[PDB]
Amino acid sequence: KYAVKLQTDFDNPKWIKRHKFMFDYLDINGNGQITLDEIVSKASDDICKNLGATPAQTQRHQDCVEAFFRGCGLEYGKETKFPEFLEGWKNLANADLAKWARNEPTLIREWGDAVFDIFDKDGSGTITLDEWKAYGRISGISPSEEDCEKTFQHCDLDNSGELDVDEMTRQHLGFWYTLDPEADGLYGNGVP
Numbered sequence: 001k002y003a004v005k006l007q008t009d010f011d012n013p014k015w016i017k018r019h020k021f022m023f024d025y026l027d028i029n030g031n032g033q034i035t036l037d038e039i040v041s042k043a044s045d046d047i048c049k050n051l052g053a054t055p056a057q058t059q060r061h062q063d064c065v066e067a068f069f070r071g072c073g074l075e076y077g078k079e080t081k082f083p084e085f086l087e088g089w090k091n092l093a094n095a096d097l098a099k100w101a102r103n104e105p106t107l108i109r110e111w112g113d114a115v116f117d118i119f120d121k122d123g124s125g126t127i128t129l130d131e132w133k134a135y136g137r138i139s140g141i142s143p144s145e146e147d148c149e150k151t152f153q154h155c156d157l158d159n160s161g162e163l164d165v166d167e168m169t170r171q172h173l174g175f176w177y178t179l180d181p182e183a184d185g186l187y188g189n190g191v192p
């Protein structure tokens with residue numbers, strides 16, 4: 001196991017292409033713009049509803065999603081195009097990396113906590129391969145049952161073969177923020 005690299009690379013076509021792929025994935029209608037309203041609706045009225053989240057869990061998850069995407073520029077009643085979106089990610093990456101460097105919880109970690117809570121009815125605090133496939137399909141970020149397995153092959157699992165928020169946060173920092181080579185493949189062949 002290795003530490004995460006905090007060095008950014010916002011100019012790398014690979015990092016920009018990754019967020020472009022996701023932006024397009026979020027831009028359902030392909031109108032070239034998204035709104036915090038769509039992101040929150042996807043989070044609360046789609047994902048949380050279909051996973052069977054309680055009212056409380058759904059609210060906490062919404063609060064975290066709202067804070068996260070506000071981090072990268074989004075806002076209610078405001079259309080955000082890719083250019084602004086990308087610039088938003090640079091600021092968020094910088095802001096979250098600054099918090100990590102001071103041992104303050106990051107927005108990416110807090111989003112993770114909300115997601116894991118939905119699958120934590122017994123106290124384990126982890127997510128099993130089967131629950132991730134569920135999340136992958138419902139959220140649409142990894143509908144491929146195969147890619148989800150690759151996610152679990154890629155990540156370091158606990159003694160039960162289960163994924164915990166600490167490891168997933170490590171991976172996401174590298175995948176979404178630093179374009180760390182060690183993170184490549186986190187989502188299988190589903191996200192470049």
Ligand SMILES: O=C1N2C=C(c3ccc(O)cc3)N=C(Cc3ccccc3)C2=N[C@@]1(Cc1ccc(O)cc1)OO
Nearest residue numbers: 019022023039042043108111112115139141165168169
């Ligand atoms: O990381 C995640 N995501 C990143 C992006 C995303 C979006 C745009 C970009 O440019 C880059 C990345 N989009 C979605 C899907 C989603 C979007 C909006 C509302 C709800 C869900 C998403 N779901 C997560 C949630 C998560 C977070 C931390 C964890 O430890 C575990 C799980 O799972 O991997």
